[PDB]
Amino acid sequence: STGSATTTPIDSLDDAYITPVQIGTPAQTLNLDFDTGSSDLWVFSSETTASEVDGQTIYTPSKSTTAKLLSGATWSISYGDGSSSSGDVYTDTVSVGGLTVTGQAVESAKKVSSSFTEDSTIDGLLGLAFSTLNTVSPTQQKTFFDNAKASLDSPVFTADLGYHAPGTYNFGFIDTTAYTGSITYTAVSTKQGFWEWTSTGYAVGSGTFKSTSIDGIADTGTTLLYLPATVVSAYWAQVSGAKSSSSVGGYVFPCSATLPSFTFGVGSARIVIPGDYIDFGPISTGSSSCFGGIQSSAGIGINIFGDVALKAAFVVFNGATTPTLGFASK
């Protein structure tokens, strides 16, 4: 089998991407944030505290004839950005882009943190990291990809995120028309439950390539590109007027400045992030100070190749017995 779904930026800055997902019988369609950095499929629901729902579409398991309470099961997550949520668990039928899983754990939120309430466009998350990070207790549950894997034509999914435009998540096949050149594959460590890999280095604009190992994760659920302070300092040094602002909490720059591209290495191959991808607009409405899309990972404890980086590539998440990551230009 295969599946193919369009993924759409939630706003004009590509702060996140939503993908429609069919849950239950009859189908309830929710727009979920596909997140290769986490491993829970959780949704706004009829069980969510009323005051914490503000425009989201909810899953109502009582209206799904295929829903079954996973007795005794609870879940609770606190993301790397101070956001959290918790609740109970149902198993139900979940379809993405024509690909159907029966008995998928659907984690129904009783509580969500304010940041989720405040984002009306995101109805929940669909985790695509490794199932070892799933938070369901007492019995950890599998991700949508893990459950689909053996049925797929090939045990892979691909992320093709757009810049200020829709893109595509495919399951079970590689669309050879969606990228240029070849796909370069690179080793993955699953030791922290992430799609974790080592970039071979970077370049700033037309500058010379610096060969250096940068261990980090491919994370569709993180907006920005978080890299070591040395690397980030070297980037913003080439933007006149750019400064790191403690009050804002990162590098900012005047919108009149021209942003250089940023290149990262995948083996001997090179992915070029155009300068425009690194502009995240005024820090506040009407400000001439713009927020940067490349920021320091110091104090995160891990480097994160988020949407800023991934949307410059066609990315293969290969779930073979030994997982690997593939990157192509597009």
From Swiss-Prot:
Q: Which domain of life is it from?
A: Eukaryota
The record places the active site at: 35, 199
* Single Gene Ontology MF annotation: aspartic-type endopeptidase activity
Return the EC number.
3.4.23.22
Q: Which residues form the Peptidase A1 domain?
A: 17-328
The chemistry this enzyme catalyses reads: Hydrolysis of proteins with specificity similar to that of pepsin A, prefers hydrophobic residues at P1 and P1', but does not cleave 14-Ala-|-Leu-15 in the B chain of insulin or Z-Glu-Tyr. Clots milk
> Which GO BP terms sit in this record?
proteolysis
* Stated family: Belongs to the peptidase A1 family.
- This protein's name: Endothiapepsin
Query: What species is this protein from?
Result: Cryphonectria parasitica (Chestnut blight fungus)
